Amino acid sequence: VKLAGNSSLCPVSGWAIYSKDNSIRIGSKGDVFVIREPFISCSPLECRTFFLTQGALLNDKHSNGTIKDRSPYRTLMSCPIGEVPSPYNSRFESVAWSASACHDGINWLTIGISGPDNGAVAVLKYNGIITDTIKSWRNNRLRTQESECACVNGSCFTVMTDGPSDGQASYKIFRIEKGKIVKSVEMNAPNYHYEECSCYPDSSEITCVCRDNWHGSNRPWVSFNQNLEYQIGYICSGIFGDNPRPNDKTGSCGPVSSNGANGVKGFSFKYGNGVWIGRTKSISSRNGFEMIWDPNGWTGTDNDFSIKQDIVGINEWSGYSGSFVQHPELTGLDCIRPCFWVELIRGRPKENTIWTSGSSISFCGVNSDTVGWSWPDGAELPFTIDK
Amino acid sequence: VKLAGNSSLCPVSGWAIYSKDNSIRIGSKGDVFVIREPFISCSPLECRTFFLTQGALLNDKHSNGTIKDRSPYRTLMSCPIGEVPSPYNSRFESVAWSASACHDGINWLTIGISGPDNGAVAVLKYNGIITDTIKSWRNNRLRTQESECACVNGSCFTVMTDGPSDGQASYKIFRIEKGKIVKSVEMNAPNYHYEECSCYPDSSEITCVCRDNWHGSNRPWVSFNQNLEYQIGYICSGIFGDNPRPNDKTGSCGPVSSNGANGVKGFSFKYGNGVWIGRTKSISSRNGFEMIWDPNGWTGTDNDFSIKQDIVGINEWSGYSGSFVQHPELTGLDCIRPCFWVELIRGRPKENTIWTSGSSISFCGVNSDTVGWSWPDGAELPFTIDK
Amino acid sequence: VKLAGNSSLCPVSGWAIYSKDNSIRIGSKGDVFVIREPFISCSPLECRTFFLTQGALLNDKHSNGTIKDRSPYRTLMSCPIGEVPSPYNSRFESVAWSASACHDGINWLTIGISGPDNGAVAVLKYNGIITDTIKSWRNNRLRTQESECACVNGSCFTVMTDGPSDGQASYKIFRIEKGKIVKSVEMNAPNYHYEECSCYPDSSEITCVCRDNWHGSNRPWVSFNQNLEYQIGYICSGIFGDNPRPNDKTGSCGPVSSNGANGVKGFSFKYGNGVWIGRTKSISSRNGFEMIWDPNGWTGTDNDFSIKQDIVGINEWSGYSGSFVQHPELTGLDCIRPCFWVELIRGRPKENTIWTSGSSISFCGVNSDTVGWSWPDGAELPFTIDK
Amino acid sequence: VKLAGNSSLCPVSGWAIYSKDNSIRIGSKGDVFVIREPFISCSPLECRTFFLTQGALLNDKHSNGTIKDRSPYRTLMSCPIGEVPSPYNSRFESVAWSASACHDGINWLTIGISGPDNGAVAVLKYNGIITDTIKSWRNNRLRTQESECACVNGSCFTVMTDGPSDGQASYKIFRIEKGKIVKSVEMNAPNYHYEECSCYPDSSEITCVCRDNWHGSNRPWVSFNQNLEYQIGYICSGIFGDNPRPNDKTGSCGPVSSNGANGVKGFSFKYGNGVWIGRTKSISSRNGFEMIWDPNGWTGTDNDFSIKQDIVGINEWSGYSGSFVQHPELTGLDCIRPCFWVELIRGRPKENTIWTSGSSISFCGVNSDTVGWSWPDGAELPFTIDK
Ligand SMILES: CCC(CC)O[C@@H]1C=C(C(=O)O)C[C@H](N)[C@H]1NC(C)=O
Ligand SMILES: CCC(CC)O[C@@H]1C=C(C(=O)O)C[C@H](N)[C@H]1NC(C)=O
Ligand SMILES: CCC(CC)O[C@@H]1C=C(C(=O)O)C[C@H](N)[C@H]1NC(C)=O
Ligand SMILES: CCC(CC)O[C@@H]1C=C(C(=O)O)C[C@H](N)[C@H]1NC(C)=O
Ligand SMILES: [Ca+2]
Ligand SMILES: [Ca+2]
Ligand SMILES: [Ca+2]
Ligand SMILES: [Ca+2]
């Protein structure tokens, strides 16, 4: 039966660790895919990890030059959550250097973008069958979430971007049914910039927290209903959510220009005027990670907060992060549970290796007792392939 | 329920990438079978990759001398599409140095030919159980499609060849039910030559596009109904489909003798007088690949064409190619969707290695937007086993 | 349907070997997790091996320093009984450096403790979904069974410990339903010490045999009904069950202070006044293993016994051991069958390696003929990674 | 539903190759168990390969000394037919240095013998649960078929041997239901010798062809009904079936003393007075293999034969062989199909290696066309571990 998506987010006081795959550590010997931009999504029966391979294994020569973002060798694959991404335990989804996926309760929808930078095509699959395609409309690296799409009442929603990553671009919202695009709309967002949206369902509507790679060290957001009637803005909190960023101070309801160039995929959960902010501990690089509750951070520019939970140490590598949800249909609860994953990036450019890859950790929001700590990657680089 | 096979091919304007396994790249470290002549076929529930192993893994000593076509060690195995062919994820089908397979909607039929060059026997299995055999009738390398057989209304059809590969030979059409041969007929084709047929269902009849290894740089074809009442001919288009071949010029409805010796397994899709032609970019070797639409190419000798889509670069290795279909029972469409796979051959004879193997890519025909590009093998030879 | 748990233990005259995975031997080449504290538990359909990984594979550099008990890299995983614990065949359960698991007949309950030594949190999962958490209440290494929890009539029971491991600590009994804690009680046990309880169901009540790490070379026990109304004591037999211990002599119904410091996880089965005692053959180190029937050993201090069966040779490595049961729902018997597993520890601290790991053997209680022998680990250390 | 076992063997004119796993070749790099005495057995849904591991992988140090027959490390495992026996694809059955297995249509029965030479115990499992045990009654290497047991009308039958392997011993027939021994009888066979019986069902009765290791270069046989009312004898044919043996001449209905010491596990199929004989091509060592039809060979001493089919070349390694059947319930036929497997032994004692292991091939009896050939192991010894 199709996910209803009409309940609100569950109240959350803390985050319980959900999984950790130790990919890099194990790939030191085992047969583990070189990967990046992993993410988690759940069917009514299980939770899977999606990832973009580089068509190579760790500690092999073909892992060389994997700093590179796009190529014909990259593919979208998935394995069970907490398991290592291996050729022996991973299912093939699509050929892609950018992707999204989500389960509407009936079947898996996957979105895989491949092809040249000036004419990339997104292939939509429903239950493993090609159901639709969309070609670049600006001919400049058509790209998408790199996390799960959001499903409500039999429809799945995603956001896509085409154009410059350092200037005004084009952003479109899609409504998809049975892997078929049934409605789309371009966002009227002059001076905004959207990348790698983390979108989730909440009371029959979708909320996306994204990445301003242009000129915003705070995060941009889009919320829309099933008819794609949307609203835009930036998270107001003085607790800046992007990386790099400036030290915490007074925030803005518009793009915070200071340290606003570049960025990293992230997320956040809106509760009334309050916000759950996941972010790196460092303001300059992709190190550490922490969850921060600002009861007034969604609409207020104050730099205060009530709660702060450690996820990854300040001196440890982190990277991308994104949201995923567990619907009532899966949990048996009467509300949509917020979860999140973190990508722990190892290798280039920060380390002396020929390769770049990441492992993952994940947490779920609970109202019972929790605790901070540091669950880092834990691999020792360089590897033998790098010597 | 059994596939009806009575709808016509879906109209197709372009080809969307469906899968890529990156076998050679991964086999550089992982435990991946040395293989060749792979192909794809679909049950009403999934799509699998079939392949002939050499009973050896890449980057191992036993991969040595794998240039050789036939031997007792070769076996027919299958794994899920897009996955690497590994001993840890592959299912054993049959002992074979030549094979075909297809699902009639109820169960898998596999055809595996093994034994000596002068008395090979084809073993038919239905749902993994031996249901029939056929021995060589000309005692000269009994061989078959190396791609999926075609199923219609509970019957599966294949084509087999016995005799010289550089002169007139013998070609038979078979009708098979529950893995049991219920009717066969010899093709009356003096001056024709058939090898490695790519056959597909279309409106209750079967169409096969094959390989004239004798004296034809254009492709031969056979079409028959369920009672094995057939027609033969050659694709007329001046867009020659085999390799090697001459530069494009005026074609023929008979075998184009020029550069007609040798060849490579290929395919094509007939739409009225028009044809979808898949072929290498090079006219001399197995490099590149492209899809070309000639609205008059099936029955006309003109060397014109409306559409051309790049699949593999001119300077990249290709190889065999073949068709497969997804029936309405699988897709939910009201027509039979045309798909195709390409074998990317690496190693001998063109490269300095002790071994020969291939990886695969696949596409499906869509009417939505698509794009050309190059999705090559991407491995760096020689391997460590070759040093 | 939920396990009834109301039948009594089956009479048992001997122990039949049930499984052996040969993990270390195979991990010498294969991709096998470095593990410790493994244990077995059964659903109404199968029996699985649970284990705590160190996030590393044998014969790899990351296996280094695995003597260490707790860290963020450790995870709870499971595979089918008798199979090697591998990334390619193991299912991920939870992030944990201490754990318990058990099936109530409907779904799997897993308990994974992670976090810092001064604030560890136990995460309860039911069917893979987080259902509850418990934080350390003494802020000193919250820890649990390291073996299966006990289920009766739809409720699962475990025992947890927080505080010193060399002095008085705090011990709590939990009642859990659908992975949700519905009742708990602190044990009033001054001068007792409980660690790593081996608990089993018997006639609608739970019996736990544990490890006094403080001052008892005989084993402590807890028995309670569904309402958590409990009794405590120590096994009286002069056949001391812990390691290290003194030579057999007159026992005590209280902690035997002599050689009472430290210990090792163990178990025992109560039959009236009699006891089935599993223990190391050595009184000083973790070598050998034997099953001993003392018809008066539960309540009597005599050092006599009727039956003695060899499991592991005196000069062979052993380690932890624990009980598991097979309910009538699984076996078809009208009684709860007692089984047990043994952890064969290799590496540090007793051997010259950088790593520490264990393999496992298991037996089931039968009333038919059996025999003693020695089923040791059988690996040759050091490994190549240690050179 | 339970196998009826009441139809007769299907008429067979030849043997079609069914599978080949290429284990040794692949284990040169892959993670493949060192094994010996493999065998095949079928459930109503699939056919599996059973084998005794040595608790080690090929090309690893622990494979050393695997010439040895019995040890605590050996285990009974199974994987799908034609697949390599790997820790990543094999299911654990039982701890054993001798075994049998068979499916009664409802569940798998496995028999695993382990323990010391002077008190071995056979553990019977039904659907993975221990259901019974039998201890050595002569205290001299209790051993069994090393091939599938035979099932008829809900009962499974096996033969076991205890005592000298070079003199008179003790042989018992067992009737087993739900893994529980319900009847047994000792064979009154003075001057006979039985080892490693290949037993099959035929018209509600069981026929076993075995190995006289004492003083018979022709094969001994036992046939019994469900009540264990039996008959004994030796295959009369002058086509001697054991190895070693003398050149073919006039046979005997008693043990052929000439070259009668030692032997090798084999099989044969009785059709009236005629016999299908599988045997090595060499009379002195375990090389080659061939199927021979002697229409009068069961009861006649003539050294004539009608049909001879090559399976393995004279100069290629062979080894054990055994029968297995596919019941009507599996095939849909109205008769029990005879199949057979061959073990291709590599390594010690005949080759310069530290290890010993085997791969397998299998065939099924058909009435359609077949052909002889040689499907050998195909590995190049020694391996790197042997250097
Ligand atoms: C093309 C712009 C885009 C967003 C800024 O770049 C991303 C940033 C990179 C990064 O900041 O880590 C990694 C992503 N793989 C890349 N996405 C693609 C499709 O290349
Ligand atoms: C026997 C003739 C046949 C068709 C020309 O050869 C094929 C060509 C070879 C090729 O051109 O690549 C490879 C095929 N493996 C081979 N088929 C067999 C059965 O050996
Ligand atoms: C923290 C005390 C506890 C019980 C004595 O230590 C155990 C003993 C160790 C041992 O004696 O082998 C190994 C266990 N992994 C360890 N448990 C934890 C959680 O660290
Ligand atoms: C114990 C006698 C027995 C039959 C002759 O030996 C067999 C012969 C050996 C052989 O001839 O190859 C291998 C078998 N693994 C062995 N069986 C056992 C249980 O050790
Ligand atoms: Ca930014
Ligand atoms: Ca040609
Ligand atoms: Ca103690
Ligand atoms: Ca003999």
Side-chain angles (χ1 to χ4, degrees), chain D residues 9 15 30-31 48 50 67 102 114 144-145 149 165 199 213 223 228 275 301 345 356-357 362:
Chain D
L9 283 185
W15 306 90
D31 291 335
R48 307 187 51 90
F50 293 80
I67 187 67
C102 60
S114 195
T144 189
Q145 304 187 227
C149 37
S165 56
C199 304
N213 199 73
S223 59
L228 270 34
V275 60
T301 54
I345 302 174
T356 291
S357 190
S362 75

Side-chain angles (χ1 to χ4, degrees), chain C residues 69-98:
Chain C
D69 289 308
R70 304 167 299 277
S71 85
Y73 318 119
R74 309 207 68 179
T75 67
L76 175 72
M77 308 191 73
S78 72
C79 64
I81 188 183
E83 286 182 27
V84 65
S86 173
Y88 313 140
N89 66 5
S90 290
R91 136 194 320 173
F92 172 94
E93 305 292 354
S94 174
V95 184
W97 40 253
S98 184

Side-chain angles (χ1 to χ4, degrees), chain C residues 63-187:
Chain C
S63 67
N64 172 81
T66 31
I67 187 67
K68 180 178 169 61
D69 289 308
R70 304 167 299 277
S71 85
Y73 318 119
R74 309 207 68 179
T75 67
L76 175 72
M77 308 191 73
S78 72
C79 64
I81 188 183
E83 286 182 27
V84 65
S86 173
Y88 313 140
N89 66 5
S90 290
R91 136 194 320 173
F92 172 94
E93 305 292 354
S94 174
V95 184
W97 40 253
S98 184
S100 171
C102 60
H103 200 286
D104 64 5
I106 308 303
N107 277 310
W108 280 102
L109 168 73
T110 65
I111 303 175
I113 308 176
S114 195
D117 276 6
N118 70 1
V121 168
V123 177
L124 305 210
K125 291 177 188 192
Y126 190 63
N127 194 25
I129 305 300
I130 295 187
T131 44
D132 208 342
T133 68
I134 345 163
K135 191 164 187 186
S136 182
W137 64 90
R138 294 295 226 266
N139 296 317
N140 194 350
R141 303 163 297 161
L142 175 66
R143 47 199 188 272
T144 189
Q145 304 187 227
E146 318 300 0
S147 57
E148 76 172 359
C149 37
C151 291
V152 166
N153 188 32
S155 288
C156 292
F157 305 85
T158 181
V159 184
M160 260 172 278
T161 288
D162 204 346
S165 56
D166 63 344
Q168 183 66 68
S170 189
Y171 334 102
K172 290 185 175 175
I173 302 169
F174 300 84
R175 171 173 175 173
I176 299 156
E177 303 175 8
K178 306 299 192 177
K180 182 61 162 55
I181 304 178
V182 295
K183 187 171 186 178
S184 57
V185 61
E186 177 164 10
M187 288 157 55

Side-chain angles (χ1 to χ4, degrees), chain C residues 118-302:
Chain C
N118 70 1
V121 168
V123 177
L124 305 210
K125 291 177 188 192
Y126 190 63
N127 194 25
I129 305 300
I130 295 187
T131 44
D132 208 342
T133 68
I134 345 163
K135 191 164 187 186
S136 182
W137 64 90
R138 294 295 226 266
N139 296 317
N140 194 350
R141 303 163 297 161
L142 175 66
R143 47 199 188 272
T144 189
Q145 304 187 227
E146 318 300 0
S147 57
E148 76 172 359
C149 37
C151 291
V152 166
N153 188 32
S155 288
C156 292
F157 305 85
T158 181
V159 184
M160 260 172 278
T161 288
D162 204 346
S165 56
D166 63 344
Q168 183 66 68
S170 189
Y171 334 102
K172 290 185 175 175
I173 302 169
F174 300 84
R175 171 173 175 173
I176 299 156
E177 303 175 8
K178 306 299 192 177
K180 182 61 162 55
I181 304 178
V182 295
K183 187 171 186 178
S184 57
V185 61
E186 177 164 10
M187 288 157 55
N188 185 28
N191 202 34
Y192 289 80
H193 197 247
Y194 295 84
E195 297 279 5
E196 305 165 333
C197 291
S198 291
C199 304
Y200 61 84
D202 185 346
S203 300
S204 294
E205 296 179 15
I206 289 70
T207 298
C208 299
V209 175
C210 313
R211 160 187 182 173
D212 181 332
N213 199 73
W214 175 12
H215 59 9
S217 52
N218 58 332
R219 295 203 178 281
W221 58 261
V222 209
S223 59
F224 48 91
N225 59 35
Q226 289 172 262
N227 286 333
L228 270 34
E229 302 172 330
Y230 61 93
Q231 295 173 257
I232 54 178
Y234 280 73
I235 298 182
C236 292
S237 179
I239 314 295
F240 306 132
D242 213 345
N243 179 269
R245 59 178 184 269
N247 290 292
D248 291 334
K249 59 196 179 192
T250 305
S252 170
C253 281
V256 179
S257 52
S258 188
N259 295 110
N262 296 124
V264 62
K265 178 187 175 55
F267 72 98
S268 293
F269 294 99
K270 177 180 180 293
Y271 292 86
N273 292 269
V275 60
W276 266 113
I277 294 172
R279 75 175 186 180
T280 66
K281 281 187 175 304
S282 172
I283 60 174
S284 62
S285 55
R286 302 174 167 180
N287 302 89
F289 200 90
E290 58 190 11
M291 295 300 291
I292 301 184
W293 168 247
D294 180 347
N296 308 292
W298 190 269
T299 62
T301 54
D302 34 74

Side-chain angles (χ1 to χ4, degrees), chain A residues 18-20 22 25-26 28-31 81-84 86 89 337 368-371 373-376 378-380 382, chain C residues 27 30-31 33 54-55 57-62 72-73 87-88 90 92 95 114-116 119 121 125 128 130 133 135:
Chain A
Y18 192 40
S19 69
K20 186 189 198 301
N22 287 304
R25 284 170 58 88
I26 292 171
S28 178
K29 173 181 176 180
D31 291 335
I81 188 183
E83 286 182 27
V84 65
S86 173
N89 66 5
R337 165 183 284 178
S368 54
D369 288 334
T370 55
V371 67
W373 208 27
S374 179
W375 293 266
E380 179 186 70
Chain C
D31 291 335
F33 281 131
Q54 292 274 9
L57 302 184
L58 291 163
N59 237 338
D60 177 82
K61 65 177 182 175
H62 295 88
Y73 318 119
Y88 313 140
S90 290
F92 172 94
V95 184
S114 195
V121 168
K125 291 177 188 192
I130 295 187
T133 68
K135 191 164 187 186

Side-chain angles (χ1 to χ4, degrees), chain A residues 65-373:
Chain A
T66 31
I67 187 67
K68 180 178 169 61
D69 289 308
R70 304 167 299 277
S71 85
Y73 318 119
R74 309 207 68 179
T75 67
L76 175 72
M77 308 191 73
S78 72
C79 64
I81 188 183
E83 286 182 27
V84 65
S86 173
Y88 313 140
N89 66 5
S90 290
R91 136 194 320 173
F92 172 94
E93 305 292 354
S94 174
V95 184
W97 40 253
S98 184
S100 171
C102 60
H103 200 286
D104 64 5
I106 308 303
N107 277 310
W108 280 102
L109 168 73
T110 65
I111 303 175
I113 308 176
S114 195
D117 276 6
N118 70 1
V121 168
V123 177
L124 305 210
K125 291 177 188 192
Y126 190 63
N127 194 25
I129 305 300
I130 295 187
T131 44
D132 208 342
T133 68
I134 345 163
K135 191 164 187 186
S136 182
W137 64 90
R138 294 295 226 266
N139 296 317
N140 194 350
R141 303 163 297 161
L142 175 66
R143 47 199 188 272
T144 189
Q145 304 187 227
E146 318 300 0
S147 57
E148 76 172 359
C149 37
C151 291
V152 166
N153 188 32
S155 288
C156 292
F157 305 85
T158 181
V159 184
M160 260 172 278
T161 288
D162 204 346
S165 56
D166 63 344
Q168 183 66 68
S170 189
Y171 334 102
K172 290 185 175 175
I173 302 169
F174 300 84
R175 171 173 175 173
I176 299 156
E177 303 175 8
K178 306 299 192 177
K180 182 61 162 55
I181 304 178
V182 295
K183 187 171 186 178
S184 57
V185 61
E186 177 164 10
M187 288 157 55
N188 185 28
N191 202 34
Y192 289 80
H193 197 247
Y194 295 84
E195 297 279 5
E196 305 165 333
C197 291
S198 291
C199 304
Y200 61 84
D202 185 346
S203 300
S204 294
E205 296 179 15
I206 289 70
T207 298
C208 299
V209 175
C210 313
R211 160 187 182 173
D212 181 332
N213 199 73
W214 175 12
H215 59 9
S217 52
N218 58 332
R219 295 203 178 281
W221 58 261
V222 209
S223 59
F224 48 91
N225 59 35
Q226 289 172 262
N227 286 333
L228 270 34
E229 302 172 330
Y230 61 93
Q231 295 173 257
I232 54 178
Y234 280 73
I235 298 182
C236 292
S237 179
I239 314 295
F240 306 132
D242 213 345
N243 179 269
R245 59 178 184 269
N247 290 292
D248 291 334
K249 59 196 179 192
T250 305
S252 170
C253 281
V256 179
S257 52
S258 188
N259 295 110
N262 296 124
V264 62
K265 178 187 175 55
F267 72 98
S268 293
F269 294 99
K270 177 180 180 293
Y271 292 86
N273 292 269
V275 60
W276 266 113
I277 294 172
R279 75 175 186 180
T280 66
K281 281 187 175 304
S282 172
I283 60 174
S284 62
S285 55
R286 302 174 167 180
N287 302 89
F289 200 90
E290 58 190 11
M291 295 300 291
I292 301 184
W293 168 247
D294 180 347
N296 308 292
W298 190 269
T299 62
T301 54
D302 34 74
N303 74 93
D304 254 274
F305 67 84
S306 292
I307 307 176
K308 176 183 180 63
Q309 178 182 348
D310 293 326
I311 300 304
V312 177
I314 182 70
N315 303 128
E316 289 292 347
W317 312 101
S318 55
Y320 279 21
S321 72
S323 63
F324 66 100
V325 294
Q326 297 180 336
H327 289 253
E329 286 82 8
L330 174 67
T331 62
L333 298 167
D334 67 335
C335 54
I336 296 166
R337 165 183 284 178
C339 294
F340 74 91
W341 54 263
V342 180
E343 168 199 50
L344 316 173
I345 302 174
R346 304 299 310 268
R348 287 300 177 180
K350 292 294 185 293
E351 300 174 275
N352 185 329
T353 62
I354 70 177
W355 55 274
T356 291
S357 190
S359 68
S360 62
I361 55 183
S362 75
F363 299 69
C364 277
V366 288
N367 235 338
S368 54
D369 288 334
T370 55
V371 67
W373 208 27

